[PDB]
């Protein structure tokens, strides 16, 4: 959980170009696929668990 967004998965550190006004990322299927650290700026791709 980062800023109220809960979930489960594996973080893989992507280089997705999140802009300053972007904190969450949803894929083509309206499914979360990336998030930003509320403290640092690292963009982590929420990949699915096994």
């Amino acid at each position: 959980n980062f800023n109220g967004l809960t979930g489960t998965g594996v973080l893989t550190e992507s280089n997705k170009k999140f802009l300053p006004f972007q904190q969450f990322g949803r894929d083509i299927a309206d499914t979360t696929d990336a998030v930003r650290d509320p403290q640092t700026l690292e963009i982590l791709d929420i990949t699915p668990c096994s």
Partner: peptide, 18 residues
């Protein structure tokens, strides 16, 4: 002074942080 141009593409923003 006060003329009237049309708003071509003017009038769209970002209603999200996605």
């Amino acid at each position: 002074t006060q003329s009237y141009t049309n708003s071509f593409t003017r009038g769209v923003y970002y209603p999200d942080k996605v």
